[PDB]
């Protein structure tokens, strides 16, 4: 099972250096692959950043990045990494690491560089001069009105994105809806996550929302009671 996983700070101040790593499992980083970084500004298109070739160390970068980019690799950790210096708002994006696959063409060759067959989940990096702010979590307590009940958690006044919410440590997945965040005039985000449950279960079942705001290294498990 070849798997890639990005990690790194979600907030970077303008003119400083964005630094990200991609942990690779299910395969050696020394494989003959163009270990690649691709980014996507929220609501916009894909942009290729570059690669490091696992079996040589050779690199190639998008000239749009103008000598700001370094891609490295670490065999002892089985990872490769990205450094992007002198960032601006144009560098705010979800950053993906990706690996090609081998498909033989009509002449017997593999052209791997533009093939992105295995992708990481992506990590949002916001370039902003504003400070990190952890969320306050409040319970949202309760065609239909009361055969099922919507209960939730309001994740209030955080920065930057993202926040993830699960319910009962991931044991509760049916009927869960985590909404896209609102950006309030304060410059802080809020979101709401709601699970719709049988109203009978409000007594016999405890409901906990597991909020994670990685940019502030903060987790909150909030019990939602009626």
């Amino acid at each position: 099972q070849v798997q890639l996983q990005e990690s790194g700070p979600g907030l970077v101040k303008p003119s400083e250096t964005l630094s990200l790593t991609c942990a690779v499992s299910g395969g050696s980083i020394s494989g003959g692959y163009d270990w690649s970084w691709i980014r996507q500004p929220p609501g916009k298109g894909l942009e290729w950043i570059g690669y490091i070739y696992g079996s040589s160390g050779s690199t190639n970068y998008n000239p749009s990045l103008k000598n700001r980019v370094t891609i490295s690799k670490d065999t002892s950790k089985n990872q490769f990494s990205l450094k992007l210096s002198s960032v601006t708002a144009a560098d705010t994006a979800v950053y993906y690491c990706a690996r090609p696959a081998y498909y033989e063409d009509d002449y017997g060759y593999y052209y791997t560089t533009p093939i992105f067959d295995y992708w990481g989940q992506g990590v949002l990096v916001t370039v902003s001069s504003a400070s990190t702010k952890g969320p306050s979590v409040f319970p949202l307590a309760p065609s239909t009105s009361e055969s099922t009940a919507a209960l939730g958690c309001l994740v209030k006044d955080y920065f930057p994105e993202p926040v993830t919410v699960s319910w009962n440590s991931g044991s509760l997945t049916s009927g869960v809806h985590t909404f896209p965040a609102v950006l309030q005039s304060s410059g802080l985000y809020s979101l709401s996550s709601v699970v719709t449950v049988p109203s009978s279960s409000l007594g016999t079942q405890t409901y906990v929302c597991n909020v994670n705001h990685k940019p502030s290294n903060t987790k909150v498990d909030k019990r939602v009671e009626i």
């Binding site: 298109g45 992105f116 992708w119 409040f138």
Partner: protein, 212 residues
Amino acid sequence: SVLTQPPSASGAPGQSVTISCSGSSSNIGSNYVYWYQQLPGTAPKLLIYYSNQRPSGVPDRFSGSKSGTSASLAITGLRSEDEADYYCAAWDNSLSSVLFGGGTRLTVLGQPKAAPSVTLFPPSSEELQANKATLVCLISDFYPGAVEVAWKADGSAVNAGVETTKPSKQSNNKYAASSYLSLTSDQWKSHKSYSCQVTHEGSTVEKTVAPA
């Protein structure tokens, strides 16, 4: 040197659509073209490689071609599940870079209207202890993706403190949005009721809460 795609495309269910990608001799004119499909909130997936080949799991409804300095993705037997952003990609010999087209958002026509489901929450007693009161109005499963949200205090239109998200496409091809009325605790208790009114395709759904 860029790859140019029309930003939008559409087709009817069961019919076909073609998505174009325009480049130059240094990228499409001399290299393979690749296509990627991206559903909402997910990473792109390889759809076409070497200009006309499909990886495992891609139906033959999807086909690719290239001629001169342009390439085309054709999709037949269109289904609502095909709504996605489609990107072309190619190596450029001049820039020594992978180029992406700007992406084409595909709409499948004829999808039926869906009225929003609306859920309204009063402030929690925990927030009220901090002298604040946020009312939360959650709006889901509506189609097409455009709503108007109005707030009422004792049936009078509220102006201050309203913030409403843009609609976002759900995994089921319908849309979701949310609206927030940020009050102080004093303002919340000062009226008998508050309402969130959601207008969609000329009809409205309104929920009311009252300080108990």
